[PDB]
Design a protein around this ligand. Sequence first.
Ligand SMILES: Cc1cc2nc3c(=O)[nH]c(=O)nc-3n(C[C@H](O)[C@H](O)[C@H](O)COP(=O)(O)OP(=O)(O)OC[C@H]3O[C@@H](n4cnc5c(N)ncnc54)[C@H](O)[C@@H]3O)c2cc1C
Ligand SMILES: Cc1cc2nc3c(=O)[nH]c(=O)nc-3n(C[C@H](O)[C@H](O)[C@H](O)COP(=O)(O)OP(=O)(O)OC[C@H]3O[C@@H](n4cnc5c(N)ncnc54)[C@H](O)[C@@H]3O)c2cc1C
Ligand SMILES: Cc1[nH]c2ccccc2c1CC(=O)O
Ligand SMILES: Cc1[nH]c2ccccc2c1CC(=O)O
Ligand SMILES: [Ca+2]
Ligand SMILES: [Ca+2]
Ligand SMILES: [K+]
Ligand SMILES: [K+]
Lengths: 588, 588
Amino acid sequence: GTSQWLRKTVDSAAVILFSKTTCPYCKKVKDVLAEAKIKHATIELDQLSNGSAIQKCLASFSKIETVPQMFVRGKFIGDSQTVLKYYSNDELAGIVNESKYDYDLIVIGGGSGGLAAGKEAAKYGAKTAVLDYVEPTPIGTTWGLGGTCVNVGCIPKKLMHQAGLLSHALEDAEHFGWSLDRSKISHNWSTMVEGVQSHIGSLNWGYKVALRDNQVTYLNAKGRLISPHEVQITDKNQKVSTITGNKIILATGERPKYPEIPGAVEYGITSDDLFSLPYFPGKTLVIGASYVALECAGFLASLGGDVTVMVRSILLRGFDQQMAEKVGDYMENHGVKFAKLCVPDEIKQLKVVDTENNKPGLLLVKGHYTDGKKFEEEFETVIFAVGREPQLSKVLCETVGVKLDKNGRVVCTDDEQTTVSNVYAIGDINAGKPQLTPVAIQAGRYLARRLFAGATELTDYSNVATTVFTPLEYGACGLSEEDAIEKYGDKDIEVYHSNFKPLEWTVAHREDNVCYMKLVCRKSDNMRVLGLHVLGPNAGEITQGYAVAIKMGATKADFDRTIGIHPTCSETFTTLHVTKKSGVSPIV
Amino acid sequence: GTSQWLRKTVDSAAVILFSKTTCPYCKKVKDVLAEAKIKHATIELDQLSNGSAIQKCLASFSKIETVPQMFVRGKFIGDSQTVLKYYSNDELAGIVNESKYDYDLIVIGGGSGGLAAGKEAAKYGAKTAVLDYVEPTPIGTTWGLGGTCVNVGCIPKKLMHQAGLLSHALEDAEHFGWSLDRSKISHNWSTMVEGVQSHIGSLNWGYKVALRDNQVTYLNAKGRLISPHEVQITDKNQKVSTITGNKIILATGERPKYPEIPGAVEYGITSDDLFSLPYFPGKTLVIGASYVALECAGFLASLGGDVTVMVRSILLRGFDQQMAEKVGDYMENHGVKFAKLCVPDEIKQLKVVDTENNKPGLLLVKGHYTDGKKFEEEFETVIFAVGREPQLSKVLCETVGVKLDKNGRVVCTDDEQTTVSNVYAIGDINAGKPQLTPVAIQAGRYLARRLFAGATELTDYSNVATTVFTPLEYGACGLSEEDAIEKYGDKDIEVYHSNFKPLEWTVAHREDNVCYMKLVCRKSDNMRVLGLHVLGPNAGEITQGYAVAIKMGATKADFDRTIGIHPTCSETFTTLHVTKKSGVSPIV
Ligand SMILES: Cc1cc2nc3c(=O)[nH]c(=O)nc-3n(C[C@H](O)[C@H](O)[C@H](O)COP(=O)(O)OP(=O)(O)OC[C@H]3O[C@@H](n4cnc5c(N)ncnc54)[C@H](O)[C@@H]3O)c2cc1C
Ligand SMILES: Cc1cc2nc3c(=O)[nH]c(=O)nc-3n(C[C@H](O)[C@H](O)[C@H](O)COP(=O)(O)OP(=O)(O)OC[C@H]3O[C@@H](n4cnc5c(N)ncnc54)[C@H](O)[C@@H]3O)c2cc1C
Ligand SMILES: Cc1[nH]c2ccccc2c1CC(=O)O
Ligand SMILES: Cc1[nH]c2ccccc2c1CC(=O)O
Ligand SMILES: [Ca+2]
Ligand SMILES: [Ca+2]
Ligand SMILES: [K+]
Ligand SMILES: [K+]
């Protein structure tokens, strides 16, 4: 392993120093480099099992076995004396900046994955460019640097969720002794959006500052990979240019799908538009049943909206369906209407949006139920949440040789490498991976370290925890119950479960036996926890810590031996005893 | 091990059936017992490593090696045919109810530990009595069944904390778009207390119902252990009686201390009084700096109170002092005044409490600072939070032979056994153990199973997670930083840390770089996580899950390999990189 690893590390690193903790000549070079403002990776051989072996294999590259040894872009540059020679002669800058390419790394896409990869790479001396361009939505919405999560995803979604939760805090406050006349309390959509957008703006700016502070070149331009190392960029002016890079990271993300029905693109909106919408949506129809559909419907209802969700078949396809049903039942019991087994046929315009007084328009939605009954209802706003899709040109990807799948996503090795060996793909366009911001960030940071600092650690995409920020939140880590039973068989699966009631809900007169948790375990494997599921407040805070234990192979016994923190919702995971096979009720 | 275990199991179990999954005669007996409403423990020998060996050792008790075998109170009763003989002859009830003692278990104390132990024991056929009596506070406050947490502890404390958090939710709601005139919003203490007390009342009742439903005898009487198996009880009428029990569980808990200064008992109150106080405390002085002191001060301030904490030396003695300082700094920045390095000398009455209009009285507190300056200030309410102490008579404990320590707590083996071998102690009076409700519950349930169902599992009291429900909450699991450095030395400890900002605080215009987390790790032991600490909202939900991983031996690498859930506070634990030794700032 050592020699193959060393060959790839030396070939790929932009500027790398092989060193030892204890080496005065190593510190000499480190200080000259720091003095010269030259960033680099460092591998301390004395902190590695195989450091001994590595130091000797280096002679296959350097002809020496001493430390320090500095390499630039695959070329041995020198020991301590040679580096100081270059420094003294003011040749060092030109050496560390010599390359066949304009950049060591070009990142195409300035979102969760691409910004994380670009910043991490720059730390090790990789001369880096990040390209980002936001193609406007059909009604012309655009936004700044940061990608989907920052601008039209997790960040504004969770902030609007919080605004919705505050509706229930206002209700609860009365029961806890606060004197407030809710009859006189209303919500102002545009005040909320202005606050959300001011925060997003601070993030757009912050990322630009972060890139500048790491000496990353930020180009607000559309990038097109036209050969393995050439990226064609088109700026706002439509000026076309070409830049070259050693490594390329595709991090271009996805955009919302529209259904192919008359009126959808003209009169509907998607999540891309919702989070900066200048007018309150008013009476709203959400078409779709993904976590985005339900999250959006949920906070619109809590903000006082008349909300309907049109569901083609099931809720939260791909998630544990028992939990999905409970999520939806809570929503229906708390205002959200569901038109189940229903699809849209056409959207007709009845009023145009009032761009002046910031009022919504009015739409007639025609569709049909599976039972043959017609759906025909007026809505002020119609939101499509029917899937997201990558935006890579299949043709041009074919030309360069980057393989895509059926769905247009990039087919990658377990180290994110595409079929073009210097080109990598991270984030939502990486076929088969969980489409989540912390996944993209971990992938991009870990990839940058393997490319430019000799790291070996891969991203682990197994048992990645999630949380759906519906009005009652749903956290999960690992297998759904049904997937566990399909994999291992019903006889090998035990499911421990319980209802519970947040203490906060008692004085507030909220529901018994609605919050719910379960552990799906494998009997044959010492009751290994295969999946954890919780429906309740703060479900993401609950779930996160357990994801560490699950990654370590937690068993039911590990949960049982841990002592609860009281009073919390999470502590119920430490005292589960009712199994599904026992038939005993999980109510409490 | 097998024979010693079997000897103790047979001796101690009230009614126990040795059985196998696959045994029709075993099911015959199980059904006769279920039919006869006879509860019992069951040990399925075919589900045990040493089942083979156990089945043969049973002959040392039964003279047979077959299953089923039923025992009552140390006596082999019969195989299947003998049990049905007794049943058919209507002798079985009298056999299973024959004992030298009135009860298999008497629990002295109806709180967190004692109720948990009593209910669990009853499940296995132990005829159980639970004694509970609430000695009134100096001003006459009393309450119902359930103990300190239910009545005057975790439950009302966290509910009043929630009422306080709702103050900040009301503030935040404006920034998230809600239209409310806070100038017109006030808090009504007595409305809050009525809601809290209605919930506590439902718990008092619920426990009484639970005891009835498990056939546990509940005596609202003061119990006194006068010999190993004899408990003298005094009812409300002052009628004295004596009942006998095989096993005794002492679960009597603690009560607040008062300082030995004039006026303290007459005019101050403690947490015992606060949670049902009929009048709003008004301008309040909390004397003490325990987690109870700070929790109480914190919610009183958030409910609009003018609050001062008088601190003799340090905050949260015994907790990580960096975190304690941050907890206190947050409180001071949010209204709570601190009279630091100050102790009280006397409490003088200026107004008596208005028991009619439910208004507080008025007190003059005289004390002095370490710098010699005198403290003299008027308060409407003075709350002592200076420690809690057990209430066991040292003399009578000596007589029976139950050893106490310096502090009056019971000295126990790691299986909760006192120096009187049939007498056990759980909960806050168990010397050296964490004084927490889930600890007491786990101890009592696990003890009941060892006594009456042949279990071997001990309670693990190591790395028990905690949360301090101050206005900004503080969760912890494992060693403080200072204790880790004392144990292993500064060179062997690495501390990863970061500030963070809840997304919820951004639009709400709350603080950057106040929430904080750290992992204290042992370098020599693969960066084992020795202590986890988090200051932030929902800190108990954050911490709980990680307690499972820490119990399993989590390392920093285990945290790093786990993927965050976004957006959450907890996910920051999965991306910590700044160490204290690096000197780099933890701000973000
Ligand atoms: C409503 C919604 C809510 C979500 N909520 C959560 C949540 O709560 N938690 C969570 O973990 N995940 C959430 N996600 C998922 C999260 O947004 C994605 O997983 C994450 O943004 C993907 O990051 P990425 O780097 O793959 O791509 P993106 O963040 O989409 O960034 C890609 C960037 O590249 C731009 N681009 C595209 N093509 C080019 C090109 N040729 N040249 C230059 N630039 C280009 C794109 O316009 C964009 O700016 C949510 C997503 C949505 C839509
Ligand atoms: C303000 C405060 C807040 C707290 N907050 C938390 C928290 O948030 N989380 C947490 O885990 N812990 C908390 N605790 C700790 C928790 O209350 C205790 O750890 C728990 O109640 C101890 O349970 P126990 O069974 O040992 O005793 P207790 O719950 O005190 O029960 C003992 C019972 O026995 C009665 N009794 C005493 N003597 C006799 C006798 N001779 N005969 C009959 N009955 C008798 C007592 O009156 C009482 O009813 C808090 C405690 C306090 C004071
Ligand atoms: C959005 C989406 N992805 C799918 C994958 C398989 C089968 C159906 C669907 C639907 C629609 C639906 O849930 O009916
Ligand atoms: C309540 C309490 N327990 C202690 C243990 C050791 C030293 C001091 C104290 C104090 C008072 C204080 O913190 O000054
Ligand atoms: Ca437990
Ligand atoms: Ca991570
Ligand atoms: K659909
Ligand atoms: K004190």
